[PDB]
Structures are given as C-alpha cells and as structure tokens.
Ligand binder design. Sequence first.
Ligand SMILES: Nc1ncnc2c1ncn2[C@@H]1O[C@H](COP(=O)(O)OP(=O)(O)OP(=O)(O)O)[C@@H](O)[C@H]1O
Ligand SMILES: Nc1ncnc2c1ncn2[C@@H]1O[C@H](COP(=O)(O)OP(=O)(O)OP(=O)(O)O)[C@@H](O)[C@H]1O
Lengths: 567, 566
Amino acid sequence: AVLRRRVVGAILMVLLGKATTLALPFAYKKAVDAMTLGGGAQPALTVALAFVLAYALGRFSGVLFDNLRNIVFERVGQDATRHLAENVFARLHKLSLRFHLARRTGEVTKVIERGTKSIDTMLYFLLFNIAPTVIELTAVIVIFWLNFGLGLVTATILAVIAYVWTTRTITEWRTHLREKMNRLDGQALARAVDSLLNYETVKYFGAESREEARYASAARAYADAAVKSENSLGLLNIAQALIVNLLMAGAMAWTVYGWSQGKLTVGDLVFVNTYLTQLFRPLDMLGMVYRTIRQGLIDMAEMFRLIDTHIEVADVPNAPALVVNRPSVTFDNVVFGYDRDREILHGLSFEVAAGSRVAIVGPSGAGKSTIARLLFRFYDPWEGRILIDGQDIAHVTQTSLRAALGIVPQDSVLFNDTIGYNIAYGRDGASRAEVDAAAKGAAIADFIARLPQGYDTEVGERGLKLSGGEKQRVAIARTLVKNPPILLFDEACSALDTRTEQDILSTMRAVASHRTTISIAHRLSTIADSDTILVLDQGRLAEQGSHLDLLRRDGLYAEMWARQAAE
Amino acid sequence: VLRRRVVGAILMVLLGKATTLALPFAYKKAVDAMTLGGGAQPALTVALAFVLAYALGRFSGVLFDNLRNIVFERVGQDATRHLAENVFARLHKLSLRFHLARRTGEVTKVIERGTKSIDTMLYFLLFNIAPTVIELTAVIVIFWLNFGLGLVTATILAVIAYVWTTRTITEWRTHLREKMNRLDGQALARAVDSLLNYETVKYFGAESREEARYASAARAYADAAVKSENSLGLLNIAQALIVNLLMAGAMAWTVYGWSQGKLTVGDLVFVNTYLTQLFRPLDMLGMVYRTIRQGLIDMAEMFRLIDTHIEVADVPNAPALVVNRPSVTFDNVVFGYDRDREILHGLSFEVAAGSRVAIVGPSGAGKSTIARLLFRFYDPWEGRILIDGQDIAHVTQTSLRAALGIVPQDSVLFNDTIGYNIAYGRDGASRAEVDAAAKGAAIADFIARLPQGYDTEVGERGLKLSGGEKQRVAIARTLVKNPPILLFDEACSALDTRTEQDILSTMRAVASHRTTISIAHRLSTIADSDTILVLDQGRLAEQGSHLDLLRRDGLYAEMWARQAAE
Ligand SMILES: Nc1ncnc2c1ncn2[C@@H]1O[C@H](COP(=O)(O)OP(=O)(O)OP(=O)(O)O)[C@@H](O)[C@H]1O
Ligand SMILES: Nc1ncnc2c1ncn2[C@@H]1O[C@H](COP(=O)(O)OP(=O)(O)OP(=O)(O)O)[C@@H](O)[C@H]1O
C-alpha cells in the first residue's frame, strides 16, 4: 500500500489511547502508597499537582487521541468509501436489462445507501472496537489472575458468557424486527419515488390526496416497525446494563468483604473500583459491536446478493471480436419470450443483406422492438440464433457487437445537460465538425441556430424541455455521430412532421451508401421506398418483399396501406 | 393524545436528575460516617450504602436513559411521519417548471438530510434545553448560597470563552459543511442521471466515461468531507481543552481551599462530584449546538427550495368551473417558456362544444404547448383562455383539472399492474368501468390473452409493455376519468392504423356530448375531424374541414400532399 504509514499511525494512536486508562490507576496507587498524611509539608503540593495532572491531562489526551485518530483516518476512510461507491456504480451498470426494466427505484436506493453507510461504519468499528476492548479485558483478567482473586476471574468469565448469550438471543430478536423495518422503509421510499416520477400523471388525474394517503400508510407502518425495533434495542441495553452493574456490585461487595474499613492490599480497593468505572464501557460496547456487526453483515449480504445476480448476457470465455466487412443481419428460427409463460416471438427467420434498406412493419405489439432488443443482445433467444456478417451474436464479445451497430430507440432518454453534450455523446471526444454534420443531417442546425445560447440550452430531465420532434432529432444526431455500419431506427419519426422526415431521409440517401439500415414504423408513407419490407404479426414473418410486390399480393401490408390511404 | 407520554418522559428525566443529585448526597453521608465513629451496625450500614448507592445509581441511570428512549420513540416516529407527509405534500404542490428542470439526486439528498436531521434536532432539544437550565441554575444557586463568589465568576467566564470559541469555529465550519453537502448532492445527481440513461449508455457503450465522471464527483465529495471532519475535530479538541481546563481549575480551587483537609466537609466533595457529573453535559452541549446549527441551516435550505413561490396559484376564493357547453377559446394568447424565447405569440381560435378538432402544423409550432397552457401548467404572458365563456385563471385548479382529460405525448405509468393504472382514472374506479375502458381502448382481448393479465407487472414507467399497449393504457385511464373535454397529444403515434381506426370507431359510436381535441402529424388520423387548425409560428393560419382546407390550396393542402406522396 501507499498509505500503510497512515494506518500504522492510526494503530499507534489507538495504542496511545491505552495511556489514559494506564494513568488513571496511577493516581490512586500513588495516593494509597502513602498510608496517612503522605508528604505533609513539601509533597502535599506534589500530590495535588499529581491529581490535577492525572485527571485533566488523561481526559484531554483521551479526547485528543480520539479526534486525532479520526482526523488522520478520515482520508483513508473516505478513499475507501469512494472506491466502494465507484465499484458499486460499475457493477450496477453491468446488470441486465430485465432488472433495470422491472426495478423499483426507491427500494434499490435504500438498499444501496444502507449498504454503503453500514459497510463504512463496519470498517471503522472493526479496528476501533475489536482490538482495544480485547486488549483491555485481557489485561484486566491477567491483573485479577496474578492477584489472590481466583473466584473473580471465574465469575467474570461466566458472567461474560451469560452476557454474550443474552446479547446473541436479543440480537436475533432485534434482527427479526429489523427485517420488517427495512422492508417497510424500502416500500415507503419506493412508493414515494414512484409517486414523484408520475408527477404529470398525478396532476392530469388530480390524485394528490390519494398519493399522500398511500405514502402516509407506508410511513406509519414503517414508524410502527421502527418503534418496535428501538424498544427491542432498549431491552437489550437494559439487560446488558443489568449484567454489567451486577458484576460491578459483586466486585465491590467482594472488595468490601476483604476488609470493611481498610484495604486488602495497597491498590486493591481503589484499583478495582476505578477499573470498574473504566470497564462498564467495554462490556456495554461489546454487545453494541456484536449488534452492529450482525446487522452490517446481513445488509451487505443482501446488497451483494442483489447486485451479483448472474447477468443474463455474459461473454463466452475467449470470445472473438465482431468483424464487420459485409454487414448483414440474419434470424435463424429465433424463438424468444421475455417470460416463460408468454411466448413473444415464435419461429422467425429472415435475412437482411449488406447495404439494404429494410423495413419491419406490423400490428401493435407484434414484437418488432423485440427484434431490436434481441439484435443488441439484451436477451439471449430460447432457440435459433442471430447472425451479423455470418457470425453468431452470442458467441462474440458484447463490446464489439454493441459498438458495431447504432440503434435509435422508440422512447429516447437524454442527459440533463446541453443539447451539445447529448449530441456529442454519440462518440467520445467528438469534434465540432462531426456534431455540426449530425445536426444538419438530423434537421436541428436551423433549430439550434435560432435558439438563444442554442448549443448550451438545457434539455431538462430525460430531455423533456425539448419537443418530441426535437428530442427524436437529437437522438438521430447522437446515432449519426456514432457512425455505425448498421443504423437501426425504432419509431424515430413518430413525433416529427412529414417535412423534417423527408429532409432527413433525403440526407441519408444522399450520403449513407455503405450502411445497412433497418427501420420499423407504422406510418407507411416513410418506408414504401425501402428495398424489402417484413410484415411481422403475432411474432411471425407473414409477408416479405418490395413495397410494390406487397401491395400487389393483396395481403396484410396491402390492407394496411389501403387503410392508411383512406380519408 | 400522546402529551401524557412526553410528560412521563420529562418525569423520567427528572428521576435521572434525582439519581445524579443523590450520588453526592450518598457520598456526603459516607463522609459523615467517615468522621463519625461507627461500629458493627454503622460499618455494615455504610458498606451496604456504598454498594447500593453505586450499583443501583448507575443501573437506574442507564435504565432511565433507556426508558426515556422507549417512551420517546413513539412520539419521535410520529413526528417524523408527520414531517415526511407534509414534505411529500408540499413537494407535489410545486409547479411544472420545477419538476421539468429539476435534478433528482440533489433534491433527494436535501430532502433526506432535512428529514433525518429534524428528528435528532427535536431529540437533542428536549434532552438539552431543559436539563441544562435545571443543572446550571441548581449549581449556580448552590455555589452562591453555600460556596464563594469567585467560583461562579470563573465558571461564567469559562462558559463565555467556550461559547465564543464554538461561535468562531462554527462560523469557520459553515463554509465546509455547505461545500460538502453541495458536492455530495452533485455527485448523487450525476449518478442518478447516469442510471436513468442506462439504455443510452448501453447503446453507445460509454460505461467507462460515466464511471470516470462519477469517480471525479466522488473524489471531490471525499475531499470536502475530509476537510469538514478535520474542522469538526478541531472544534472538538478546542471544546475538550476548555472543558478540561475548567475542570482542572475547579479541582485546583478546591485543593487551594485546604490541601490536607476541607474548608467544609461537603465543599470539596460536592465540587469534585459535580465535576464528575458535569463532564458529560459539557461535552454533550457543544455537539448538540453544532448539530442544531447544521440541522437548522439544512432545514432552512430545504424549505427555501420547497417554498419557492409556486408559479400557478388560484385567485383568492375563486368559483368552480361550471361546464354546460364545453368549448375552448384562445384570445390573443402570447406565451413563452423562457423570457428570452417567445414560443407562442398572438394565437386565437375557437373549439365549440361536441366538435372533434385537430391541431396540425410543423414540428415545434407549439401544439403540446397549447396542451400545457390549457391545463394551467403555466400562466400565459398576454391574452386569455376560456372554457364555456369562463376564464381559466379565475377558477379553482381542482375543478379545471378534473374537467379535462389529457393523453400526453409521453405517457408515464406507475410501477404496478395494468389494472391499477387503468383504475387510476377516477378514485375507487369500479372494475366495470375498468373493463369498459379496456374495451374502449382495444385491450380487453389483449389483457384476456395475457397470463395473469390484469395483474401483469408493467415495470417502472410501463416499459415492460409495448408502445401501442402503453398508449392504449393511457387512453383507458383517460376514459375512466370521463371528462367533458378529451385532449389527445400524439396518442396513436405508436399504434397501427387498424387499432387507431377501431378505437376511433368505438369512441364516435359511444361519445356523443364529448368535446374532443386531437394533435397529430399523421394526417390519416385526423382527416375525418370536424375542423382542423393549422398552427404556424404560434398562430392560427387555417381552420376548417379537411375537404375545405384541401380545396383552399393552403398550408394544410401542402402537408397532406406531402404525406400522401410515396
Ligand atoms: N419545458 C420547456 N422548456 C423550454 N422549452 C420548451 C419546453 N417545452 C416546450 N418548449 C419549446 O416550445 C416549443 C413548442 O414545442 P412543442 O412542445 O409544442 O412541440 P410540438 O410542436 O408539440 O411537437 P413537434 O415539434 O413534434 O410537432 C418548442 O420549440 C420547444 O423547444
Ligand atoms: N419486460 C417485458 N416483460 C414481458 N413482456 C414484454 C417485456 N418487454 C416487451 N414485452 C412484450 O413484447 C411485446 C411488445 O413488443 P413490440 O416490439 O411488439 O412492441 P411495439 O411493436 O413497439 O408495439 P406497438 O407497435 O404497439 O408500438 C408486448 O407483447 C409485450 O408484452
């Protein structure tokens, strides 16, 4: 390590923490060492100064060592928290698409925050509690063993065994309550966040009172659970305090039975009572430490089980890269369903040669966007296989496949940033020439120009500050900056007017020559000039061929095109 | 109802004070038996008294602390719940510009910090404000009656130095705490924005860039937190220095009273026991003042972000919107989102009752802006909107928003079943209404064919459903609401022409007294509308039937010739 000297200094400060509980009994030992009127004339000032120094300097050194070890350890602790956060973020982005589609934001946020905070406190308390408490208790047991007190050490170890057994049982009880408390907290936050994401929906339907009521129910449930958990905590604390105070009372009774008025040895009475006043804290701390360790272990196990769920899409060991010389797309008996109970895509097989401009039309919910998701290997198909340039998709690394094609999604999402940043996100470090070329290609050059502070205009969350047509155009500009050999369009021009769509199609036909392009849309006025059209229905390829051919065959595509041309 | 509970808690506090005041009384009786000749009975009684006093006193202290905690748990959790409910409510009371331009991470961080700080504020308030007053008044009275005058003056001067040092170091720490909170919020907001674009990140393969940017934000936050905690440690060591110096000074004063003996048998004993009982409140009060300061500034910031003057506010005691003949009128309406860019200038048109009107025009001409303005999301700069000859601004927001049902361009669904989304149209919607709306939006057979159909999860924002299925569900919600005015904003953009014709056929077959507004680009969907409004540069350029507009050889004729060209 590079900061090993830092943790060494922290451990040294911990060891120096022993100095306060070492100097505390020294005052009593020096005072009782003098029997009566110890140092009457001259050493009276000396013993007074010894008392003052011991007390004040010991307490000050204890607090000073605590704050100094905290200050020196802050850097290491925050670096550990930052590394943990980065790795959590990374592994979170590595998760599958089914998760991010069916997730609940509030519960995940609560679990992640609880895991981070609890693991940090674990990392602190391990080295700050386990070592000093063990050292202190062992030193006390050794001091009591070297003395004539033999029943003392046996009673102490038996009482500590009873203490840890009771702490274990009540900690199991507290864990039982904490599970319900955490469940209710997660549900309450998830309900609130979902209510907040549907703000426009709530306002459209005027159901603010209903959202408030449901969140209130979740919150009062969580409040009751927390009250019960804290009462169990208080019960554990009073049981631990009972055991500790009974041990201290027994030690005091033994030391008074030794000699009522006097003391057995010089140090015995004072040393024992001062060590009880110093030892009531480690015994109270050990139960809290066991509780914190148990709870942190269970919550970190929950987080790492939720995070390390096997990602559905995983590259084969020593998988090659996707080499695209002639970009073709082939589906070979591809059968897929999102869940096992509903088969979405049935036996589907089709071919898309290089340089072709192919269309995929069909009814609502027939699985065209499913074809788009499968081509990008978001889900592995049940049967059959997908091929790009005669190469299987699953048998190739995800990185090369996903970089070799650029898809415009049906519902686009934009970063809360300027239009310029969103457009330049297409490729890392995009030159302004590429950005301007994509803006002119996507029909936003005139629009951004007419905007005040145009390229720096904020688009808001998910790009909702822009219009539908503008958002679609920005998505097309991103995918144009990416410049893939295969450019997929998923209902991109649904919000655009016909003029902008005609302009952008003319641009694409004017420049794009070597790209294989597949487009899926419902308004058939946009794809009637495609090379071939695929009519998809109930997840099966029903018709395939040119627009004129499909219109002459008097099939489903001809029916849909006659239905659209009706006024 | 739970005032009796906090009364009992204060009584438990008083019992803890009784134990802390009976400990030095027990020690004073111990010394009374030290100077007085004892015997068998007195020796037995003083041994029993030492053991009982010590053990039962510490046991009662810890037990009273835990019992105060247990008794206060209920009231504290109810207070936290009430605060959370009011925060949630006032958060939903905000305007649309806020929720559109917000950054989720920083707002969530601010709300969580405020909520988790107010509980501890109320706790330390009820555990410090009362006991500090009681302790300081009792100690000052005892030192003034029995003890000397220099004692209280030295104590007050040390307290003045302590509070001055706390003031200075807290002034120093405010900047660092503010910087730490700002950086934490920015980092979390960046992470949340990265996660919301998960599909985008996967489409462009920019995980490394997102990780690097988040790492930058996180290391900035880490440096800020290190500085803040170091300043905290400096305040703590300064406070500890002052406290230990005062304790050493008091002990030195009582040893100066008499080295070997005591001036009064109770004087030195009371002072040393009072030091051993006051070292804890002095250590706690500085931390409590710091926590109170930070929580107060956090709560002030939260309520400043929440209580920003809401843009849309109903006029005082405004009447209800009475709708007998539902019409929509725009009268010289001039509006822009930002002051520098005027979106909609000089627009005036009429939509009579029972008509099926369309709003067509170029991209970004302000159609969805018309939808936003009709629902009173923003007040217009000039002009006015009228419903049934009644102004919108002079009417309550609730009645207006209930009088209209809007299908948005971008629909959003709760992470719940299809049944819950459809039933959201009206409070406590009967399943007959849900089935009727499902039949109206052409989903009855679809939901039937689904396994566990009505209970099928739609995921967050309904992304587990298709585009067309999602649009149909939005239409079903708006049909369940059953408003007199039905606005559609690009609702059937994802549907095929067959489903759109089926749902329009159903609606025209049933809907007779409904006023319908439609916004679309695909003119095959609105070519049978009663009237069409051509919107251009934020102005009504053409109005009339499809045949009329196509005969006038205008802008609509150009658009319909461009769409019908293949
Ligand atoms: N929240 C907002 N912040 C800033 N500008 C906005 C906001 N909402 C809309 N606009 C702007 O107002 C203008 C009107 O756009 P509008 O949303 O009406 O698009 P539209 O015409 O309905 O959709 P399309 O462009 O697809 O036809 C656009 O230029 C848009 O950029
Ligand atoms: N996560 C999921 N879980 C279950 N089913 C899913 C999921 N994602 C998609 N589907 C199913 O796939 C189908 C939608 O895919 P498809 O590509 O047909 O939508 P689409 O063509 O965009 O719809 P439309 O044409 O109606 O806009 C639906 O039947 C839907 O239930």
